Structure 1
Amino acid sequence: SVLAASKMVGAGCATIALAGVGAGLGVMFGSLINGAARNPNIAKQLVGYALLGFALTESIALFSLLVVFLILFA
């Protein structure tokens, strides 16, 4: 079963793509702390900018996670 053997080394090697969405959300949520430290009066607005950026950067993380059941479960 070399076809099913290459599934998990394939879907495993697909999962390096979830590194940069963590490295991206780290500088993004680090800049949420940096932005609120510089302008604390609009900290009510800046979380709405981070969560809008959290959903659209995860779009990659659900583009990366749709591969691993397109390898295994397809």
Structure 2
Amino acid sequence: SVLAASKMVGAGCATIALAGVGAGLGVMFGSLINGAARNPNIAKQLVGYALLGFALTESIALFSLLVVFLILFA
């Protein structure tokens, strides 16, 4: 069973792409605080770019977990 043993260690290292969208979502959400500390007037519009930036950075988490879904379950 070298195939099923490889799809576990293959999908194991396939998930460390989530280190990037975990660290990228910190510097995007860290930028929201230093964006809101400068002008709190626009801090309800800056969430509208925070969640749009969140939705497009978790497209890569949706691609990284798709390769995990495709190595495990193809």
TM interval, short-chain normalised? over 0.9
User: What RMSD in Å do the two structures reach over aligned CA positions?
Assistant: 0.5
How far apart, CA to CA, are the structure 1 residues paired with 2:69 and 2:58?
17
Which residue of structure 2 aligns with residue 32 of structure 1? 32
How far apart, CA to CA, are the structure 2 residues paired with 1:2 and 1:26?
38
1:7-61 deviation digits (Å, cap 9, x = unpaired):
0000001011000101000000000000000010001100000000000000000
Q: Please list every run of at least 4 consecutive aligned residues from structure 1 whose deviation after the TM superposition is greater than 4 angstroms.
A: none
Unaligned runs of at least 5 residues, structure 2: none
User: What TM-score do the two structures reach when normalised by structure 1?
Assistant: 0.98
How many residues align structurally? 74
Give the secondary structure class of the aligned counterpart of 1:59: helix
How far apart, CA to CA, are the structure 1 residues paired with 2:43 and 2:21?
24
How far apart, CA to CA, are the structure 2 residues paired with 1:44 and 1:69?
36
| The structure with more helix, counted as a fraction of residues | 1
Unaligned runs of at least 5 residues, structure 1: none
How far apart, CA to CA, are the structure 2 residues paired with 1:46 and 1:69?
33
Q: How much has 1:69 moved relative to structure 2?
A: 1.1
Give the secondary structure class of the aligned counterpart of 2:67: helix
